[PDB]
Symmetry: D2
Subunit: 409 residues, 4 copies
Amino acid sequence: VQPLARDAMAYVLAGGRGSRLKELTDRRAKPAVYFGGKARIIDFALSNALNSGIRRIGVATQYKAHSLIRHLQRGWDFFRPERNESFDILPATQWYEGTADAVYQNIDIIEPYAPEYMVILAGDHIYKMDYEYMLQQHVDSGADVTIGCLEVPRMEATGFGVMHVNEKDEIIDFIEKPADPPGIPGNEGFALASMGIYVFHTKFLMEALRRDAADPTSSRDFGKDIIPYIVEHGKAVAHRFADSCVRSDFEHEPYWRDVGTIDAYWQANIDLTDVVPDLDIYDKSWPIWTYAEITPPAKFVHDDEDRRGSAVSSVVSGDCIISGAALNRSLLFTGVRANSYSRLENAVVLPSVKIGRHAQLSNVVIDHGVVIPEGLIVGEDPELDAKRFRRTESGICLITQSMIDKLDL
Amino acid sequence: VQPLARDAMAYVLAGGRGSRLKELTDRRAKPAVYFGGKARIIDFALSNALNSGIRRIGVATQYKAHSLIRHLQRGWDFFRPERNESFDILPASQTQWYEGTADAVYQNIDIIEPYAPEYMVILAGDHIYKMDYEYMLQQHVDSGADVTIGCLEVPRMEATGFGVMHVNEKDEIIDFIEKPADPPGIPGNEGFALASMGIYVFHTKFLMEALRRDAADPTSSRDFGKDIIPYIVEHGKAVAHRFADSCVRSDFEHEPYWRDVGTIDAYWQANIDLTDVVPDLDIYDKSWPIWTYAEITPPAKFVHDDEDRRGSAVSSVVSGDCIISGAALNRSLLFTGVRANSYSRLENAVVLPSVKIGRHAQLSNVVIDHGVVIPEGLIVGEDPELDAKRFRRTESGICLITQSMIDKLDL
Amino acid sequence: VQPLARDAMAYVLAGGRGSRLKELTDRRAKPAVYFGGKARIIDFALSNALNSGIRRIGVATQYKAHSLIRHLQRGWDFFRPERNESFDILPATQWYEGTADAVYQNIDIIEPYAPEYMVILAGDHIYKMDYEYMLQQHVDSGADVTIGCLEVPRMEATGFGVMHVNEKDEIIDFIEKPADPPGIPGNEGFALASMGIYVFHTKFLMEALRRDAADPTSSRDFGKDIIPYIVEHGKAVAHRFADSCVRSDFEHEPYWRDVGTIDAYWQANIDLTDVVPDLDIYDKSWPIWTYAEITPPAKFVHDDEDRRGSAVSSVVSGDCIISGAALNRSLLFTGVRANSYSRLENAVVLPSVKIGRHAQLSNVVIDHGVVIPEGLIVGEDPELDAKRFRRTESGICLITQSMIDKLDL
Amino acid sequence: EKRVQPLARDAMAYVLAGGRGSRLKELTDRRAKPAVYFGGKARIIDFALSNALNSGIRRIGVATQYKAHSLIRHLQRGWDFFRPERNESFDILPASQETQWYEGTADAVYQNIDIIEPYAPEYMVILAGDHIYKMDYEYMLQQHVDSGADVTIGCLEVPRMEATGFGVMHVNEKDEIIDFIEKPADPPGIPGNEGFALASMGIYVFHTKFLMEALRRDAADPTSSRDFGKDIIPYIVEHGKAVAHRFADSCVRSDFEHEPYWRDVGTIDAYWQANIDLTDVVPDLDIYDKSWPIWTYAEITPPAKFVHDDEDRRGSAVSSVVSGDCIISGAALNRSLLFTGVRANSYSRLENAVVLPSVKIGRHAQLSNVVIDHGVVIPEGLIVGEDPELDAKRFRRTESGICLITQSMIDKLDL
């Protein structure tokens, strides 16, 4: 009779340590990692909730949340309770004992709002999805939990929490990374991979997590304790990402990215420099909100036979001054200073980085605020680079300031 | 002890047609004209008021002000009355419009009175400059003047096109002259003259009766520069305040910066000079920021790198949400949202927001109005007689391009 | 599945004079008249749009617009275009030569948004409605216009532009203020009363308006020209208020008021003093947004035999100081200051009113900011009362500052 | 130089808000003292924040600690209007920057040097965030640079009998501090005017340069309790120059406030008194002074509604202060102060009651000389203020007969 997103509350689990992103997540959680030239990773789930019409949002934080909390304070500050909206930042006596405990310790935050539906969201993935489709299916199916799932070729799901399904898209088994992922009935060769997105009726959810906290035997996680429990003792249904995903007209397939490794993080950002990227960051119909300040425009200067500031096949944010520096196939976040006779290629450059004169960097990820000393060469000597910085097996160097300062060169 | 701006209300006069900007001000008052890549002209005076600590701002607008008013509604929306801040947009009505710039104040006494400020800072809303108004506020009460007037220190040859302040040894105004052929020089500093910036400071009580006396005078032109100021220069006490004293000069600004941008060449030159390696105006300054209306936009993007086409910008300023797809930019300033397409070329171009450049177009020495769609293959800057017959072209060689003109050509 | 509000624009008509409110609207448009103790009239239509899910709103203004426009600038300032929200104030040859011209002159504001549906609203009524219902009837009905109608007893409708329908609620004729109004077939005694709420497909509305500006015989009005044009040539289906009205559990009937006359304005505000008011201003599930400031609480002072500052069976806003004044069956907006030995009864007191000592006013509407001189008496001399101020037949006095200024006797 | 621009442009206010409100007992059990409500809408911390705002300080940092959940949430929702590109900043700084908490009140600044120094403020204004007072810090800033002092301290001029509970500053003819004693049993006196002493408000103005010096060389010394008044301040009064700034010179008074207002509300009786005092005809604190307004977090709420007038119930407030969204239904209120959302029902009576937000007073309940905690649902027929011995056993009753009532005591309730 009315749209269901009115009665929904998005609960964002943003306690991801990153870990596999190494120094990139040393002083910040993975949802706080920058992506795309402007936003952060957590901005996609939050914008999905906003654009789906969900007016109540909770975000549970955990590992090194100081930068994430400050981002959510400064950027997602426009919710007003008297308009029936709310944005609750819910940081962790001591740590949360998992991710279902992240919902248990904040019952007294949710239950005052009395939402009828809770949309449990992973806050460390890049994707655009209309959660109204997932809410309608949860009501129409009468399930205890609806789980969003990717349709992935049956060889990529080997590194995924895979749900096996029958012909009515009801989940009959969950397997953590099966060696031979079970396929879709009548559509073998594709398996359903878990997105970490679950829809519950709130009364059912409050009861389920409460039983979990009364189980000293439990690890207090949705995927290892809660989700297997309804899969076996109850009713679980799968929601396919392709049904809910919001595709631009310049998007060639449903887009979802885990950016779990340094190589995957690098590839997802550099792919935005392509002629027609997989992710349309120019889409106005399903916009991504984030914290942004009014910045001066980007500037390209110098044009001698010695030095020319210019960008080619590149994405350049505002407040960037490209002073006699050559940029090719590079993505620059806000406020980057590149100085004369320097050159960057295949570089993901996080905000407020300064490139010293005569430096030459190839196939790199430069962390926030790093000052690259004058004349530094990266991407030329693999063994020297693997000694000075963190180098992936395909030649991408993660460069942090603590690596830079520990060089007598 | 206490700062004077706490008890001051900046009153910005924003009803300037800027007639000599021609089609650039067709449907837009001069304070609403875009400048510098992101801001509009009126944002400088308002940002000077804010950064000087003046928490009450009134903006008087006149002709074709819908786009200016919407800018003020959207960009300057953060003032809170219960924190003793206010931002009043005061368009003419609430019999015709404002009879003059002094009537612009007079019609709005009942807006000014409830605030009861002790000082009134009358600002021109159509100039580009940075200034700390507390210095001027400080000189006013220490001088006992009836009005303090902000003045540029310009060489006498260039002061001939200004309203010039004749000043004695105490910088007291003994005569005001409209565009003198031989401008009176500063005593002891001949060769320089004092040119009015249109910045005034009054005690609010003094100002209210002046404009009320001006309103009860049928002879009056109802204008500050013609009726109120020349009245004080001879019957009251008028003192000049020197812009060099109060100008907020960035460390990378070689001189006090003030631009009128009163003609198309002057508007073009002021914008295009921000592409210098060291510009006169520092748009990367944080100590005295210029606030404006801005939205979150995607970054600028450059695509294609062939021998046929290469998207790139050299010696240029490029705002966000600009897609430079196989287009070659040189010495150009692009506002937000520009789409430049394959095989096109821009040189010495000021390109206002949301302009599309079609493939194979080549434009040199241009000002392209907001939202203009340049047809594919158009050439500007190559045939002066053809460009002048097609567009508004200055005698210096700069074309102003509007969509009306583009729609008016088979050729 | 998708809510239709996501793709609609609410276009509020707020250029009304409210002439039978007399000096209450001498310097304000009727949509800017205060109502309820904190809000103004137009806030209800705007809140209905916001709560229905509509985030693109345009408000056309005309007569006495400054305080209305200043109200919209500072109260409805939280919309952000890059979140696909918009709020346009449209005071945009002289004025609006009608009401259909109010849209025609602002097509250049509308069709760039390219909304799929237009919801044309009257901005001078007090009501709570979910516009998703009428949108969800419009696109299923396939009509060229859905018109919101109140089902009123047939002798109330004599002041309405009345339409009658068949068994399928299809509008066959439109009669403006019928002396003997046509009743609904089958169940007569009641009639459909048009509320001035129109729903269109945007592409249809644009043509209907441009063909209405083509005809020179046109008064350029919806209800007078375009609306009767479609029921004669196109398809119109009425929509019943009771199906869409948002009623609290404490509102015993669908609430809608016109407050067209001073007596009707007084009545609607004073009825809020009831124990069980017809309008529940405490319904948080459909809240009315307005311009509001942080204000001090209400203060009640003095308690002697001669003076006692207190309010009984009244509604008192913040920043109100009831100092030795006795209030009874009154409603006070923010900022009122009633001083010692004064007495108010059956009074609607607009913001910032000052009641001097010993003043005793009864059955009045006091205009915004009026200073009541000490010892003034109203309500005891019906003959003297009509001579100083404006008295209705029922004996309600509207008091403005100008009436007080001219008071010798 | 200048001598024209205000010093506040180059200052940053650092609000210490990590206190426990020790003697407020159950009122600060799940709130820090800066988060305790005061006045009818605002919380205690809003006064120091508003003083900084209205003084011209656009850079604020708030250090939190003990049970900071609702305090931090209050700061996120209310104090959210600062924009860094306008040279404004509001930093919420919880104690997670190391080992457990902040070692002290000076540790709260040293742990956050990395946030302070990029701003590069010229002057540091250290504020206690648990006092009710209105003050223009610009007077203190300008005094600091004309004095050449190392630290300037805000001081209350109180009779020496009352200065026995404060940190007392011993000054000379030039109000230059000679000594500091922690709560002297017989405090020293001011030259030219003894019978009075200078008591520390906990307000310190530093040159940021030297403060960073004093804080870094205070972390690397295990002799220090890592506090300003206990460790930093006494160091300067000995090795440098410490000057006393008197609240009477910078206090912002209304036309309706007859004396420099400063309250500590450190106990339940003091807290109850400070709120009830607002119901007086001429209050000591003028909450209607719009020249120095107190900003806080507030929502659009419905008005206050009074209803019923029979022979035995009449909803009415007398000599009281009633906030919005209050429905006084057949309830009589006298000498009370009600925050937001309070629901008082028929035949109930309140006298001398400070009623925090969203309290519900049940029918026939009669309460006298009480402080009711936020959200407490008073059961029907409850009688408080009638039986001193039984009220003392059921609730937190003060030595002067004020009962603090929390929900943790309404549930635990018997004969």
